[PDB]
Amino acid sequence: MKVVVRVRPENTKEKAAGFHKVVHVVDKHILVFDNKDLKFVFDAVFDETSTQSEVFEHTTKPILRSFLNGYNCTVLAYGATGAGKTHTMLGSADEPGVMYLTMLHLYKCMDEIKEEKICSTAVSYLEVYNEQIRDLLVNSGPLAVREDTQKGVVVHGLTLHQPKSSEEILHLLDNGNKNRTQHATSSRSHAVFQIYLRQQDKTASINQNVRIAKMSLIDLAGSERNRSLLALGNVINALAIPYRNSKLTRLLKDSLGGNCQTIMIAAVSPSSVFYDDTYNTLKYANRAK
Ligand SMILES: Nc1ncnc2c1ncn2[C@@H]1O[C@H](COP(=O)(O)OP(=O)(O)O)[C@@H](O)[C@H]1O
Numbered sequence: 001m002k003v004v005v006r007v008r009p010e011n012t013k014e015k016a017a018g019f020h021k022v023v024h025v026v027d028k029h030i031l032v033f034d035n036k037d038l039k040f041v042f043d044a045v046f047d048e049t050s051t052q053s054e055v056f057e058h059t060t061k062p063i064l065r066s067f068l069n070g071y072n073c074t075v076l077a078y079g080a081t082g083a084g085k086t087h088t089m090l091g092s093a094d095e096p097g098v099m100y101l102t103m104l105h106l107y108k109c110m111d112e113i114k115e116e117k118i119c120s121t122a123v124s125y126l127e128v129y130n131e132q133i134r135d136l137l138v139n140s141g142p143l144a145v146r147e148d149t150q151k152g153v154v155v156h157g158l159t160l161h162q163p164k165s166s167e168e169i170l171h172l173l174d175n176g177n178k179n180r181t182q183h184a185t186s187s188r189s190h191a192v193f194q195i196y197l198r199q200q201d202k203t204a205s206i207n208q209n210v211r212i213a214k215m216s217l218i219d220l221a222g223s224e225r226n227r228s229l230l231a232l233g234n235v236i237n238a239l240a241i242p243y244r245n246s247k248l249t250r251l252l253k254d255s256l257g258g259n260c261q262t263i264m265i266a267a268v269s270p271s272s273v274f275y276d277d278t279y280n281t282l283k284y285a286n287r288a289k
Pocket residue numbers: 007008009048079080081082083084085086087088092267
């Protein structure tokens with residue numbers, strides 16, 4: 001598991017009331033929390049000026065190399081409410097986040113390799129709220145987690161989609177985000193965007209049985225002081241396995257387990273009003289390595 005940290009910039013109000021900053025980014029790998037004057041080291045640290053592109057380049061852009069080699073991949077956006085999880089994963093109208101950037105790059109990579117491999121993909125978007133799985137793109141009752149013969153986790157009843165263009169990708173993700181359980185969006189909504197890749201050699205037959213590769217991009221529930229969130233942590237400690245303890249971890253039974261390429265983007269607010277939130281998130285992220 002790769003672990004990176006994203007420090008968001010303070011908002012207009014926070015700056016006016018200019019309280020002391022609780023996080024100081026030294027360089028690409030090192031930050032300082034706070035006294036306690038704690039030095040943390042991470043695979044990557046993105047400061048207040050980081051663009052979506054920089055985050056993408058150091059997160060899913062490399063992991064896509066693994067995805068196109070048939071490895072399941074997982075990206076977990078973790079941290080307290082207001083820290084940046086959604087801006088990072090979904091983004092805004094001006095700055096599309098990691099889900100969109102990932103999808104465009106995937107489409108570009110599939111086009112580039114068409115002389116070596118035959119590809120097709122689909123995506124789904126679901127929520128876990130209160131141990132209930134809801135399809136975010138079609139109004140349906142809660143769904144259950146099953147397993148195929150090859151120990152692929154399936155969500156029976158989840159709809160699959162094929163947005164071809166930039167705008168369809170944006171529209172799908174926006175619709176999905178608006179159907180998350182409301183509070184603004186509930187702080188306890190986990191949102192799980194998944195991409196399914198079928199890939200085969202040029203010379204294989206068109207119905208060769210091929211394992212579907214899965215990338216999960218996950219905007220987690222807020223960690224501010226929820227069986228799913230804590231179960232996630234039980235699994236993460238463990239690894240460094242209680243997958244069954246929760247709906248979320250059951251979901252990821254095939255997507256965290258050794259083999260998979262996984263990354264955590266710990267989002268943190270730098271303001272001293274979020275001292276405790278940030279301290280806990282930083283300790284959690286430090287645990288995940
Ligand atoms: N790095 C960023 N750059 C600019 N604004 C950000 C950034 N990260 C978060 N924000 C802003 O702070 C806010 C809270 O971010 P959000 O992603 O919704 O938090 P979370 O999903 O972790 O609860 C939003 O208004 C968002 O636009």
